[PDB]
Amino acid sequence: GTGYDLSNSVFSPDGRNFQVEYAVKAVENGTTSIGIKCNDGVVFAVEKLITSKLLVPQKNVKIQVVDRHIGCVYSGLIPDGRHLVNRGREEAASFKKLYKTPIPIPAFADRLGQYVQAHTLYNSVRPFGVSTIFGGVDKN
Amino acid sequence: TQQPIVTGTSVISMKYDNGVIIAADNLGSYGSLLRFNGVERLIPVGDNTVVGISGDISDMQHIERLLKDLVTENAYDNPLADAEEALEPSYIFEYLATVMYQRRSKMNPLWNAIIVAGVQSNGDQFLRYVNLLGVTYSSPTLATGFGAHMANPLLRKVVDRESDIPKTTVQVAEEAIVNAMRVLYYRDARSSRNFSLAIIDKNTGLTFKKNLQVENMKWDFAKDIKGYGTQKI
């Protein structure tokens, strides 16, 4: 018997979390987005599909700022991405509140990392349907 | 329920034909100890707004960090942050005023008198006051603490009702403001010679002058004063 894939935090007998693997499928199905690191910064870019002439050009911005120095872009379920970014924004505010300095990008990466991991621990949540490219410049 | 510890004295301000001026000295007093000497109490927010703060300095610093956060937050998912959707002085004011009144309602005030000065996007001058009680008011001139008693009378000589605003220039407003800092330094035991001043002008933008000094101080007559009544030498 199987059904190891019906429920978020279940290990399959080869040790895999099928729900996460299916969340990847929603990502793969998304618009392409990318990031390139240059030698003093980073660049983010993304493909936005024009479903129709009716979309106002320039207006449905996909890339998001966190704090003042972090950019994130993502492919997959767009609302999931926003929710990730709302969390990132709380997470950087808190860090800045307590420590005065703006959040270092490695620190910030782990904050998103832990939160997204959290959503693979329980069957009462679903995993994120995005992959996020993100980064910026910090004290080093 | 608290008590101010490190404090800033008057913030004074007025409006002129094309904008607002606002000034505050650089001292953080600790009761009667003139403790700190490079304290900035004018907070620029965006290119159209200065927030002048008196009262408790710890609370000042807290308001300062709130204001940074407003700028961050307004920037988020906002392609028009540097254009039509910038922070207006009126928005920054309603925000502070809400905070001040909520904190008085919880019996735990931010111990300050604040003046928001700036220019609205349509060019209109903005000058409004809020304090630890959440009490708010506007006037062509506005001053806090000691300034209300000594600066207002002089600033009101220059701009006395609304119709004086179109008649009054930056040169004349700045003159009046600078003059008032001089008078406040003469008689306020919690004031400093050093001050910051800011002009927010609908054409020329925000001008922020640091490290000003009270000029042209009359002290000569002091040599002819002996005794307290009957003494001769």
Ligand SMILES: *[C@@H]1[C@H]2C3=C(C)C(=O)C(O)=C2[C@@H]2O[C@H](CC[C@H](C)/C=C(\C)C[C@@H](C)C[C@H](C)[C@]1(O)O3)[C@H](C)[C@H](O)[C@H]2C
């Ligand atoms: C001289 C002002 C003054 C105050 C607080 C005041 O009550 C008063 O009556 C005077 C008078 O000002 C006259 C000029 C008025 C004009 C609008 C102001 C000018 C040119 C410059 C300001 C910086 C002057 C202050 C408001 C003042 O220092 O405080 C005359 C000069 C009168 O001689 C004088 C009594």
